[PDB]
Structure 1
Amino acid sequence: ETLNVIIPEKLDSFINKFAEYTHEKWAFDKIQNNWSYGENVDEELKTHPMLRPYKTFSEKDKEIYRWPIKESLKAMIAWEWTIEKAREGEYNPQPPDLSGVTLSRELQAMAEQLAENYHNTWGRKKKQELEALVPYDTLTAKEKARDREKAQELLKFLQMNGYAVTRXXXXX
């Protein structure tokens, strides 16, 4: 339940911060592959029209980053009631220090639960699109090496501004 979730005063800043972190990471990734600057992005010269700040775009330009930065946060707030800021906050877009804090024993489980919730939401969207097929618990390494970067980016973006959401022989 993400569309029927409560939106607090911290979500309106967290969605913008996730959009800014996604834009800075995408610009830093485009800066290494020799990207050009153009009005429309094409596959010939690898043009970049979205290399700008988060507050410098408009409503038609934030339409590819508004709902995608809000649905996952609403799903995390619906899975665990944690809406709080209790710590400090931390073209040429410079990305911040994302490898400063290591994942704790609860934080790694929260990142795993966010990846599982995102994979289940993606599977429900794919099933609804097929009606109008992949679990993350038994996924292969070719999918686990590709799906984990979104969970790591979402965890590294949620960990800033104090929005830390906190939750085979022996068994045989």
Structure 2
Amino acid sequence: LDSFINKFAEYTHEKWAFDKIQNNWSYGENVDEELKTHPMLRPYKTFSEKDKEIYRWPIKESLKAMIAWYNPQPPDLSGVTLSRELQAMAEQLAENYHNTWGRKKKQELEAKGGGTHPLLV
């Protein structure tokens, strides 16, 4: 929504960075079998533009469509369970993954030169 949204990509990385050290992916060049390292061992608060292809505007529109209608520690988010006022809204948030990306999914197989997939339901 605001400049705080840049810290949401931190959370997506804070959980994503924490398990790598937990699972031998420490640091040094990239994800690899012979190396078994963590490529992006760096906070997103002061980040480069390589994650702007995943986070930012794609995650902004994730948080902007709603208004229309190094060992980081990610905190626990399940402190408050989503009641039916919000549980059915996550039923709509999961619908976004098949609407925003699903529309691209229809435009993914129709912009390659053919192909069909049963997921289009």
Query: Which TM bucket (shorter chain)?
Result: 0.7 to 0.9
Q: Show the counterpart of 2:56.
A: 66
Match of 1:114 in 2: 93
Alignment of 1:23-172 (within 5 A): 23-78=13-68, 80=69, 91-132=70-111, 133-135=119-121
User: How far did 1:18 drift?
Assistant: 1.7
Q: CA deviation at 1:14?
A: 4.2
| Cα offset, 1:67, TM superposition | 2.8
8 Å CA contact 2:14–2:72 kept in 1: the answer is: yes
Provide the C-alpha distance between the structure 2 equivalents of 1:32 and 1:96, rounded to a whole number of angstroms.
16
- Normalising by the residue count of structure 2, what TM-score does the alignment of the two structures yield? 0.79
Higher relative contact order, chain-length normalized (CA < 8 Å, sep 6+): 1
The CA RMSD measured in Å over matched residues stands at 1.9
**TM-score, normalization by structure 1:** 0.58
Structure 1 unaligned regions, length at least 5: 1-10, 81-90, 136-172
Q: Which whole-Å CA distance do the structure 2 matches of 1:50 and 1:27 have between them?
A: 8
Distance in 2 of aligned mates of 1:129 and 1:46: 32
Task: State the aligned residue count.
Answer: 114
Distance 1:42 1:96 in 2: 28
d(CA) in 1 for partners of 2:42 and 2:80?
A: 27
Q: What is the percent sequence identity of the aligned residues?
A: 97
